[PDB]
Enzyme design. Structure first.
Site, PDB file in Angstrom:
ATOM      1  N   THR B  11      16.611  51.583 -53.515  1.00 56.61           N
ATOM      2  CA  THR B  11      16.286  51.193 -54.882  1.00 56.61           C
ATOM      3  C   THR B  11      16.781  49.776 -55.183  1.00 56.61           C
ATOM      4  OG1 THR B  11      16.365  51.956 -57.185  1.00 56.61           O
ATOM      5  CG2 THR B  11      18.411  52.107 -55.900  1.00 56.61           C
ATOM      6  N   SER B  80      15.116  56.569 -56.337  1.00 55.21           N
ATOM      7  CA  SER B  80      15.332  55.949 -57.643  1.00 55.21           C
ATOM      8  C   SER B  80      14.153  55.040 -58.015  1.00 55.21           C
ATOM      9  CB  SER B  80      16.683  55.225 -57.632  1.00 55.21           C
ATOM     10  OG  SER B  80      17.068  54.798 -58.929  1.00 55.21           O
ATOM     11  N   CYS B  81      14.331  53.714 -58.086  1.00 53.86           N
ATOM     12  CA  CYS B  81      13.191  52.906 -58.518  1.00 53.86           C
ATOM     13  C   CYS B  81      12.162  52.687 -57.419  1.00 53.86           C
ATOM     14  CB  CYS B  81      13.659  51.546 -59.050  1.00 53.86           C
ATOM     15  SG  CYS B  81      14.662  51.699 -60.541  1.00 53.86           S
ATOM     16  N   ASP B 208      21.749  64.941 -61.719  1.00 52.07           N
ATOM     17  CA  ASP B 208      21.591  63.495 -61.704  1.00 52.07           C
ATOM     18  C   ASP B 208      21.985  62.946 -63.072  1.00 52.07           C
ATOM     19  OD1 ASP B 208      20.601  60.835 -61.736  1.00 52.07           O
ATOM     20  OD2 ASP B 208      19.034  61.380 -60.262  1.00 52.07           O
ATOM     21  N   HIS B 236      22.915  61.612 -58.272  1.00 54.87           N
ATOM     22  CA  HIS B 236      21.749  60.742 -58.113  1.00 54.87           C
ATOM     23  C   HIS B 236      21.547  60.323 -56.661  1.00 54.87           C
ATOM     24  CE1 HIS B 236      18.633  57.988 -59.360  1.00 54.87           C
ATOM     25  NE2 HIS B 236      19.312  56.922 -58.973  1.00 54.87           N
ATOM     26  N   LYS B 237      22.636  60.164 -55.907  1.00 54.52           N
ATOM     27  CA  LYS B 237      22.576  59.725 -54.515  1.00 54.52           C
ATOM     28  C   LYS B 237      22.633  60.932 -53.574  1.00 54.52           C
ATOM     29  CE  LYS B 237      22.332  55.205 -55.112  1.00 54.52           C
ATOM     30  NZ  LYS B 237      20.968  54.556 -55.169  1.00 54.52           N
TER      31      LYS B 237
END
Lengths: 258, 258
Positions: B11, B80-81, B208, B236-237
């Site tokens: 990301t 993510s992004c 997350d 999140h990771k």
């Protein structure tokens, strides 16, 4: 137990990231830790081709020490080639250095040329295996030799006992590096008042597969450190394979000198 | 077996290093893995201020896909992004993509502006805390916002359950990043023939702390994935906190689509 401020200096090709295990281990005991990218190392934005000497390569360490609050002292910990950074730093900021700690590291002296122990390292370990060499021309027309460390050298000689995740990390962020050996050979010797006067602690393992035991013992005999801590097992990257034992030794350095 | 080739895409602000645990785990199962730095990310030598759009930022993915021999397909895993990188790549190289895997990731669609799910993300998570913001002017006079993720955001919202050593690593190699949101908002929509046609697998956790559950559930309802895998716990990771479980899921993706 004293708390101290440790400044951790990675070796050529590497970056501050090599200290990602040691930094929180030291902080657990209340120490302050600063881990810096040298020029063109880690995520530093400069490219090595714009760097002209090992002294210029060490600029982030010198710049940090200049900014240190006056009266504060640090323990500078250098791995592998970073003993050169310690000596360079001590000849500008001796009053700010409680001790230098050498971690399977080059140990320059004061009576020989700054390139001396580099020459001896390369004589002891002349074949860097799948490492690839490049050249560029510096500021004043000198040809500088750079290296991209080979994957087999990384796996077997530098990260011998590190986890597979740590080895993959290394490949993922490794940069080119240089010894600047020909420029070191013309550099004035490290001084007695600066580098010569700092306390020097030498940490090493005889299982290191690039800084070999006869070489490290030669360095110890050539320029006797104030203390020598031999660590059993591990590999060249003791701050990964023997993180807690290194942190414990660094506490002893703080208790002795900080 | 057909060799499954996973192409792992970090990301914004991050680099290939985020995959240093998942890559050897996948390789233990016999898969081929390629982990790339995007432009101005990881140790890529470009600075973000020279990049003009998310498409330019995606160049290393696009160049790698170009290099793939005819007949070879990859499974692109974006965190993510990086869901935006998957859509940009799929509009140019659909025939080389066996599937896209979204890992706590933005899930763009084909019927809204490319910036649509970015706007919804920021509505859901508007306060990036101690993150610092900067601006520059791009190729066409648009002002680009870059960010340096704050340490508290990193610790508590991105790396919530990661080890201290992993959090410290992240701080040592993190770069500036940009969503290029206002440029995405003027970009042609992603195509059905390209992005719309790839198989899409959505991996996420309701723990997350930045891509929050109402947002992630909304993305799934907005654009139905072919498969949804919800992982219990982690953060999140997930490629750090649930590496083996993610690898097991990716095996299932290979079984279905490689």
């Amino acid at each position: 137990m004293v708390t101290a401020h440790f400044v951790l200096i990675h070796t050529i090709c590497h970056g501050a990231w090599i200290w990602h295990k040691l930094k929180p281990a030291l902080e657990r005991a209340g120490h302050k830790v600063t881990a810096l990218d040298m020029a063109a190392s880690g995520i530093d934005p400069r490219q090595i081709e714009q760097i002209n000497s090992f002294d210029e390569y060490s600029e982030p360490l010198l710049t940090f020490l200049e900014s240190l609050p006056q009266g504060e002292k640090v323990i500078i910990v250098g791995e592998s080639c970073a003993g050169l950074n310690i000596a360079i730093a001590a000849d500008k900021y001796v009053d700010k250095i409680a001790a230098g700690v050498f971690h399977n590291s080059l140990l320059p002296d004061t009576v020989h040329s700054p390139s001396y122990v580099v020459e001896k390292l390369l004589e002891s370990f002349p074949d860097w295996r799948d490492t690839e060499y490049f050249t560029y021309t510096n500021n004043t027309g000198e040809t500088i030799t750079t290296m991209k460390l080979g994957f087999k050298l990384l796996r077997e000689n530098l990260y011998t006992k590190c986890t597979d995740e740590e080895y993959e990390l290394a490949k993922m962020v490794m940069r080119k590096g240089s010894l600047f050996q020909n420029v070191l050979a013309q550099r004035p010797k490290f001084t007695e008042k600066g580098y010569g006067s700092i306390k020097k602690v030498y940490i090493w393992t005889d299982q290191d597969k690039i800084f070999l035991p006869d070489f490290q013992r030669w360095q110890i005999a050539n320029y006797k450190p104030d203390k020598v801590y031999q660590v059993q097992g591990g590999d060249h990257k003791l701050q990964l394979t023997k993180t807690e034992e290194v942190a414990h030794i660094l506490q002893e350095v703080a208790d002795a000198y900080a």
